[PDB]
């Protein structure tokens, strides 16, 4: 299907506790493959997936340089932004940067995005044309103007349309044995009485990759039961995902409920019952 190469960068000021903490993580689809963290002596970009272990010094040297340079620029950005918003040196503040390229099923560029947040809210966004920006307020308007001065959209357009796509293809080849492997969920139902009158039915999906899944309970073979208890899809810790959904039902009425699981790894949707 579609594939994506994305990074998530965070810089947090730590007033009187050292310089800002900076962390970068890169993903292909739902798989982390690199990280950089400056909370350490001589910090380097390092592999975080087995298939990246083979990369040589050319790669690690260039990616460490980029991450170190970004950390420095983010450090300066944090000071500037305090300036724009008339904030003292006393509080801690956050700058986030996310970006990515997305290939469609036909294996070519479909979309690229880039966005900045300050203190957990949108600040500056690259527009869909990848040639202009949207600023949330008068402070971000200055950053917009600096970007226009510096032809920053051109730099980011070249990364998103060209470099990001070239490397996404490389990574998909390097890691194909796992990245292109659909792992379907192992599913089961649990059943626990709550009272004389009611019981919990819980539908589990375990061990699946990628993360995208739909888990629903249906009553009487149409629709979805209201007030289904869902949990956010969570990592197993081994590169696969887990999710469950639960309903509370009247005792003796369990046969009216079906759990429905859709996942790219399943030949067809799975239906479970108690």
């Amino acid at each position: 299907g579609s594939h994506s190469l994305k990074y998530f960068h965070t810089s947090v000021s730590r007033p009187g506790r050292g310089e800002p903490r900076f962390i970068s993580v890169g993903y292909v689809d739902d798989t982390q493959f690199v990280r950089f963290d400056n909370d350490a002596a001589s910090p380097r970009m390092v592999p975080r997936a087995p298939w990246m272990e083979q990369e040589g010094s050319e790669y690690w040297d260039r990616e460490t340089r980029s991450a170190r340079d970004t950390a420095q620029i983010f450090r300066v950005n944090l000071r500037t932004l305090r300036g724009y918003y008339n904030q003292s040196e006393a509080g801690s503040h956050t700058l986030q940067w996310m970006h990515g390229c997305e290939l469609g099923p036909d294996g070519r560029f479909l979309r690229g995005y880039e966005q900045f947040a300050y203190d957990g809210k949108d600040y500056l966004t690259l527009n869909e044309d990848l040639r202009s920006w949207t600023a949330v307020d008068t402070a971000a308007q200055i950053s917009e103007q600096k970007s226009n001065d510096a032809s920053e959209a051109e730099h980011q357009r070249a990364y998103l349309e060209d470099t990001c796509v070239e490397w996404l293809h490389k990574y998909l080849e390097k890691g194909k044995e796992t990245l292109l492997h659909l792992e379907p969920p192992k599913t089961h139902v649990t059943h626990h009485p709550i009272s004389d009158h009611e019981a919990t039915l819980r539908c589990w999906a375990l061990g699946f990759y990628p993360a995208e899944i739909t888990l629903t309970w249906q009553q009487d073979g149409e629709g979805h039961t209201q007030d289904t208890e869902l949990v956010e899809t969570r990592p197993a810790g081994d590169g696969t995902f887990q999710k469950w959904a639960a309903v509370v039902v009247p005792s003796g009425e369990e046969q009216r409920y079906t759990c429905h699981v859709q996942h790219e790894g399943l030949p067809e949707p799975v239906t479970l019952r108690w």
Binding site: Y7, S24, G26, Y59, R62, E63, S66, A67, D69, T70, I73, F74, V76, N77, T80, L81, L95, W97, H99, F116, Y123, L124, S143, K146, S147, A150, E152, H155, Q156, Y159, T163, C164, W167
Partner: peptide
Amino acid sequence: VMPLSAPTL
């Protein structure tokens, strides 16, 4: 790989 340019705000 990550971008070779990091925007100045």
